[model samples]
Target chain A: MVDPVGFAEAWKAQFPDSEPPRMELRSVGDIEQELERAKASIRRLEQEVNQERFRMIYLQTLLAKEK
Target chain B: MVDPVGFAEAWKAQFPDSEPPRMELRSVGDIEQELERAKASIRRLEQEVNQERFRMIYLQTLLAKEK
Candidate 1:
């Protein structure tokens, strides 16, 4: 079976002479910065989801009791 | 002004004898894998947030209409 062409490989094949920069090695600091940002987002979203979950539960209870 | 020591430097200083492996350069492939996973998580959570937002809007509408 033929292997699928990867994005960078496809780009290079299509423009062997003028291919734009592909993925470069990431520095430890860069990765850490990205991971820290992602972690912050995950923390915020997790709290938001939890708060919404609680609100949903309360609203659901209120609706059920009224019926 | 004295610059604070970084984590790797502090680790090596604390354990000059048996310091565990420190942050190493991440290859393009490694970075792509990590980035892809993070993106997947971000996409899923974004959808979750949107769904919760819609549900909250619906619930509020229902409650307001009843009163």
Candidate 2:
């Protein structure tokens, strides 16, 4: 988790017009679970991105070598 | 595990003028530990923030709802 000092405010921006709720300092286990969920989601997104990048690189290499 | 293409460039902004280091897709264990440490720090800071928010809410509610 990022520093709460800046984070609460930053998070609140996402819910503008509402007073930011107080953050609960729940157990590490709870926090870990949340982090893991986030990581899993990110991992899926990363896989798609990596595939596209690899495809682009392959095409560029083929084009350069064709001449 | 965010999409590295945009992520690497965005992260580089934190260290402007420095070449962004290539990201290594290492084991999740290393990243998990780092996330835990961050969550721990945020948890401590959140305790203070929650206490203050609770006090504010209590005082405001008391003043507004008092007979």
Candidate 3:
């Protein structure tokens, strides 16, 4: 079987001047500020998911009361 | 501290018949399955955020190199 991972590496090696990722960062402070903002967004999303889970668990237990 | 938390409770107590959340779940299995799906979504979002954080940290450290 031909190794797919190795094949990709060979292809990238052949095209050494491929277009790179467009990273948007100006300075160290810029990176820091972006990271903080990104972290806050992550936390907010995670919290919402957690709250949903909490409500689900509560409802589950509440309705789980026997027939 | 105003402790504004109790004010909401008093308001809710006065208007007791508030419209509750429209939860869509049929059985325990449904709840469990939905919880699992929600968890997977949370993990996927978290992973994306984590990857962004990793890239930002690397870029931060790279640019923090003082002249």
**Top DockQ: which candidate number?**
3
User: Can you tell me which runs of candidate 3 are displaced by over 4 Å?
Assistant: A1-22, A26-33, A52-56, A59-67, B1-22
Residue-level lDDT of model 3, residues B1-67, one tens digit each, is 4123343464354444443333456665665666666567665655555554544455455546721
Candidate 1 i-RMS: 18.0
Q: Looking at candidate 1, what is the lDDT of residue B36?
A: 62
User: Where does the lowest 10-residue lDDT sum fall in candidate 2 chain A?
Assistant: A1-10
| Model 2: lDDT of residue B7 | 44
Residue clash pairs of candidate 1: none
**What is the overall TM-score of model 1 with all chains considered together?**
0.34
Candidate lDDT (C-alpha), each: 0.64, 0.61, 0.51
lDDT of 3: 0.51
lDDT, residue A3, candidate 1 = 21
For lDDT, the strongest prediction is: 1
Which 10 successive residues of model 3 chain B have the least lDDT summed?
B2-11
lDDT of 2 at B62: 55
What candidate 1 gets wrong by more than 4 Å, as runs, is A1-25, B1-67
Sorted by lDDT, highest first, which candidate order results?
1, 2, 3
Instruction: Give the candidate order by descending TM-score.
Output: 3, 1, 2
Model 3 complex DockQ against the native: 0.16
DockQ order, best first, reads 3, 2, 1
